[PDB]
Design a protein around this ligand. Structure first.
Ligand SMILES: *[C@@H](CS(C)(=O)=O)[C@H](CCC(N)=O)NC(=O)[C@H](CC(C)C)NC(=O)[C@@H](NC(=O)[C@H](CC)NC(=O)CCOCCOCCOCCOCCNC(=O)CCCC[C@H]1[SH]=C[C@@H]2NC(=O)N[C@@H]21)C(C)(C)C
Ligand SMILES: *[C@@H](CS(C)(=O)=O)[C@H](CCC(N)=O)NC(=O)[C@H](CC(C)C)NC(=O)[C@@H](NC(=O)[C@H](CC)NC(=O)CCOCCOCCOCCOCCNC(=O)CCCC[C@H]1[SH]=C[C@@H]2NC(=O)N[C@@H]21)C(C)(C)C
Ligand SMILES: [Cl-]
Ligand SMILES: [Cl-]
Ligand SMILES: [Cl-]
Ligand code: NA
Ligand code: NA
Lengths: 306, 306
């Protein structure tokens, strides 16, 4: 038993991380097969990141204007193209450690592991969620771009995020592995703001089910609620409205625990209105929203089948 | 910027994980060089884990009573010995992926990454701390024994924990890699209890420095305190007494931020007496104690030198 912010094992992604340098710009690349993927802003100088012309910048470059190092061993670039906001660099050697993989574009509320990298080298792993405003609450410094987010399913790595920038609020923005931004953001040093964020209601409910699985039951009450009366309360506390589809995906946890989804909604309603009274739930004084229903089943049972 | 519960990249440890089976007991082993390390209770049957005689159980076994699988490929055992609560299994093949490593025994308050494993296969990574009562607040199920805790320094893996059991309070106990229990625990299914736990004061202070580094400053006040007047308050809230040695190891964060350690103690005193008033610090309503001073410097700067 126990319930932690759990990330996927990072080794399969570590074997893909390389360094990419173009001019006075160095960052991280993802080496899969004979392609290295990386943020297109590697082709900028610092003096030219406010409103760059990537199209011009790219034609002006040749394959020898890209040092790719896999640790110590240079990889010769033999081709270069841009898709949306990523650079694809064709190299002369397929990565022997390329895992089984997919490029996926995730939905807001979905979680993933981030391998934070510097100088093409893995530094740390943590878990986070695509926020409803298409930002992530990451931990990233200068040099971290090209770090990726991923889920693992079987021996299959689903890459979902590549890091590009920090907004002034201290939150992070990036792309899918086809180079398409999550949210209404562009890769330039302009005054962009995220939407006001919201609490991921279905994840809060999933995490109250994890608390019950782990013997933490004090907040369960004898009441029920309708979906609309729940949303009337929840939206007052800046929770996303709960949808029938979200009730549906909670069904397996409801069946496992014997607590009806709208009964768990009743418990959450009372927690929002009354607060916790100095109590905690799985060691938290806040209601956590960065575990999906799948995350709860994986950590509480699925891992034993690894 | 940003501050997450960050684990070390797990790939170097993933390359060491194998499965060990002896009879009706399967768990995880750590394969370094030509030795596999694992909990000695692999030599029990379930019916015989209440008060086993490991000495007897061990002599009754031969090298062919141990199936070691590195994924699909069996490793022939050519010798077997017991040190404290670990089994060492000599095999005929040194692990080609053995990292540079040390066995270290950590202190209470120190943090480490856990690679949780089932069937000799990596399932998840999370960060935790050796609690003052020599337990850890883990996430472990049936099949997880032999999962390890570690820190990485350079390319060097310091192994500090091997998982053996869960106490009735839902917390975890285990050994160093020489098989010595952290705390007053034994590897048998008897009614053992941990000491009442305490809050790791120096880690709370480290995490208030991380909050200041990351622009979260609301809780800083104009006051100072003496060490004894601080401990008078802190011990009332179940905090470990702050020692001069703990003040000393906060010095680098004090110099970086320009906030004197005893001024930060004054801010923590006011937080303990008044509470947060619905405010949060780095997204928490509780004062977090599972980041060391080193953890804060690593995540806020050190990683850029990876
Ligand atoms: C990874 C990179 S690496 C290489 O280090 O590995 C890092 C990861 C960072 C992290 N901590 O997570 N990423 C980066 O460093 C980013 C790279 C960028 C290429 C995306 N950068 C950042 O993350 C930086 N973040 C930002 O800069 C953010 C969001 C991008 N923004 C801000 O912080 C707020 C800044 O606002 C300042 C105001 O900016 C301008 C306002 O925008 C509107 C104007 O836009 C149109 C521009 N117009 C022109 O240029 C016209 C020119 C010609 C006509 C002119 S000339 C005379 C006329 N008069 C006029 O008025 N106009 C006419 C960072 C580093 C975190 C801060
Ligand atoms: C990893 C293993 S694996 C194989 O699955 O990979 C797992 C990880 C578990 C996890 N979730 O983290 N680990 C385990 O399964 C552990 C393996 C063990 C070998 C350590 N087990 C556990 O973690 C279990 N945990 C526990 O069992 C814990 C702590 C060990 N304890 C409890 O939960 C509380 C249980 O208390 C029950 C009472 O027990 C007995 C009281 O103890 C005092 C007595 O001790 C002396 C015994 N005396 C004798 O035997 C005397 C016999 C002869 C004389 C007798 S006969 C007639 C006379 N009359 C008398 O009165 N006496 C005389 C677990 C699985 C989590 C619950
Ligand atoms: Cl939701
Ligand atoms: Cl302390
Ligand atoms: Cl909290
Ligand atoms: Na919803
Ligand atoms: Na102390």
């Amino acid at each position: 038993s126990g319930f932690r912010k759990m990330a996927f094992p990072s080794g399969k992604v570590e074997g893909c991380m390389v360094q990419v340098t173009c001019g006075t710009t160095t960052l991280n690349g993802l080496w899969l097969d004979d392609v290295v993927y990386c943020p297109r802003h590697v082709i900028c100088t610092s003096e030219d990141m406010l409103n760059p012309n990537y199209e011009d910048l790219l034609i002006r470059k040749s394959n020898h204007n890209f040092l790719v190092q896999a640790g110590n061993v240079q990889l010769r670039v033999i081709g270069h193209s841009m898709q949306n906001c990523v650079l694809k660099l064709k190299v002369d050697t397929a990565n022997p450690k390329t895992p089984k993989y997919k490029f996926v574009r995730i939905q807001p509320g979905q979680t993933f592991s981030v391998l934070a990298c510097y100088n093409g080298s893995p530094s740390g792993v943590y878990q986070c969620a695509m926020r409803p405003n298409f930002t992530i609450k990451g931990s990233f410094l200068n040099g971290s771009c090209g770090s990726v987010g991923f889920n693992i399913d079987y021996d299959c790595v689903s890459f979902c995020y590549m890091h590009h920038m920090e907004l002034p609020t201290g939150v992070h923005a990036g792309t899918d592995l086809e180079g398409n931004f999550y949210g209404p953001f562009v890769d330039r040093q302009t005054a962009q703001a995220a939407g006001t964020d919201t609490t991921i209601t279905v994840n809060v409910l999933a995490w109250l089910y994890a608390a019950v699985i782990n013997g933490d039951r004090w907040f369960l009450n004898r009441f029920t609620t309708t979906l609309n009366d729940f949303n009337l309360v929840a939206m007052k506390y800046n929770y996303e409205p709960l949808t029938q589809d979200h009730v549906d995906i909670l069904g397996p946890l409801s069946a496992q625990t014997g607590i009806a989804v709208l009964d768990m909604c009743a418990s959450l309603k009372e927690l929002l209105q009354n607060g916790m009274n100095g109590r905690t739930i799985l060691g938290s004084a806040l209601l956590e929203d960065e575990f999906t229903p799948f995350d709860v089943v994986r950590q509480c049972s699925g891992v034993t089948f690894q």
